[PDB]
Design a protein around this ligand. Structure first.
Ligand SMILES: CCC(CC)O[C@@H]1C=C(C(=O)O)C[C@H](n2cc(-c3ccccc3)nn2)[C@H]1NC(C)=O
Ligand SMILES: *[C@@H]1O[C@H](CO)[C@@H](O)[C@H](O)[C@H]1NC(C)=O
Ligand SMILES: *[C@@H]1O[C@H](CO)[C@@H](O)[C@H](O)[C@H]1NC(C)=O
Ligand SMILES: [Ca+2]
Length: 394
């Protein structure tokens, strides 16, 4: 057991092939399956796992009653093998958490889980199962993190946190840890911009993040930083907006440096992802411009360095007749592909129930996972499949 370098370049991919589909809500119609959100994936040197947040209720149980949009003391971070349903008997407990990130050194699992009150929350760092350090809130306004896999290189692990208003200017910080101990941190000066729920991946020894602007941007913030936490910050250059809500593409002018919004798209967003491809970028986005429906991945030529509108490839993995949700990025290590680049992958969450389906008293989601390959692959629509409403809704 050795630290994983993860200093290799990210692979160039011409398509994404489906990897897993957990069918959790379908199974949860009769089986014992957690009500969950945001099923993100992280990979160790021997295995990939689906992490998720749950409040301890099971599908078709009265405790799934969704009631209010708060943050709960009941909410926890758990994990299952990639492709498994988030069920009661396979789930492995990682952390108390209503916001979380997790990744793997190469030696041990690292899990960061945030709990506590909105005005004085704190993060507990779990390393190999154990509380090893704490990060306190520095702005006392809902301390929160990625909701997807963090990044470990050369025995050091990095993640991004936000403290401040969700619809106004906030504070954004990069953290560096070693064996679960925070060894450095850096605040990202980003006036006018809004960083929230970043999807990060390693790329040639640097960390590259595609995030969500919940304030004034229908384009996605971009954050890149090195092992000293020296950074550059801005927005995805491409003249294609990839947040939700947004406007149609022809009604949009891109920007590498500033948030572009208005037209009724402000004060919301969705977690999403992108992958730098030399000068171009693979970027995911919902098919619908106003709601979380459908999903597609766009290869935007030169879209990482200029405001290009040239889409050279588009693959739909979920049609606009089906509910999508969050998306996030992760990478497969080389101790397992025997390649010399890092394979880019993404997971897709598919939300069922409230708010879009109001005859159900609950909200949960299932997932599909895709990885990039050398050749082009066709798309299809791998929808959630659960038939709603459920029995508890009667
Ligand atoms: C408050 C800042 C963030 C980013 C806008 O806001 C997020 C809005 C999200 C959205 O965009 O829909 C929903 C997120 N969230 C997740 C959950 C939940 C998770 C597991 C079990 C049950 C509920 N509840 N809310 C919420 N992050 C939290 C910690 O509040
Ligand atoms: C869910 O909560 C509402 C409001 O408290 C209540 O009217 C309803 O009966 C509850 N449903 C279940 C299944 O507990
Ligand atoms: C991926 O493609 C870009 C496009 O020019 C190239 O610069 C880069 O070297 C490629 N990376 C690998 C690992 O092949
Ligand atoms: Ca937005």
């Amino acid at each position: 057991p050795e630290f994983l370098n993860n200093t290799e370049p990210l692979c160039n991919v011409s398509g994404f092939a489906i990897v897993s589909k957990d069918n959790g809500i379908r199974i949860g119609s009769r089986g014992h399956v957690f009500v969950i959100r945001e099923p993100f994936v992280a990979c160790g040197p021997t295995e990939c796992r689906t992490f998720f947040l749950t409040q301890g209720a099971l599908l078709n149980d009265k405790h799934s009653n969704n009631t209010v949009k708060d943050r709960s003391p009941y909410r926890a971070l758990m994990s299952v093998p990639l492709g498994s349903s988030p069920n009661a008997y396979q789930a492995k407990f990682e952390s108390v958490a209503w916001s979380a990130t997790a990744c793997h050194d190469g030696k041990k699992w690292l899990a960061v889980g945030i709990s506590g009150a909105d005005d004085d929350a704190y993060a507990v760092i779990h390393y190999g199962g154990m509380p090893t350090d704490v990060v306190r809130s520095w702005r006392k306004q809902i301390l929160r993190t990625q909701e997807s896999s963090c990044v470990c290189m050369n025995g050091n692990c990095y993640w991004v946190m936000t403290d401040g208003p969700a619809n106004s200017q906030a504070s954004y910080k990069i953290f560096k840890s070693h064996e679960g101990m925070v060894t450095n941190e850096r605040e990202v000066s980003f006036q006018g911009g809004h960083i929230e729920e970043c999807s990060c991946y390693p790329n040639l020894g640097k960390v590259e993040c595609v995030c969500r602007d919940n304030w004034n941007g229908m384009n996605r913030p971009i954050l890149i930083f090195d092992e000293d936490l020296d950074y550059e910050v801005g927005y995805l250059c491409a003249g294609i907006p990839t947040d939700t809500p947004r406007v149609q593409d022809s009604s949009f002018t891109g920007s590498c440096t500033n948030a572009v919004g208005g037209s009724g798209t402000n004060n919301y967003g969705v977690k999403g992802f992108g992958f730098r491809q030399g000068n171009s970028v693979w970027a995911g986005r919902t098919v619908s411009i106003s709601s979380r429906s459908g999903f597609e991945i766009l290869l935007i030529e030169d879209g990482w360095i200029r405001t290009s509108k040239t889409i050279v490839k588009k693959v739909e993995v979920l049609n606009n007749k089906n509910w999508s949700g969050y998306s996030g990025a992760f990478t497969i290590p080389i101790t397992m592909t025997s390649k010399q680049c890092l394979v880019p992958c993404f997971w897709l969450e598919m939300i069922r129930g409230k708010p879009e389906e109001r005859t159900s008293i609950w909200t949960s989601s299932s997932s599909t996972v895709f990885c990039g390959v050398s050749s082009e692959v066709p798309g299809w629509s791998w929808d959630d499949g659960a038939i709603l409403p459920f029995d508890i809704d009667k």
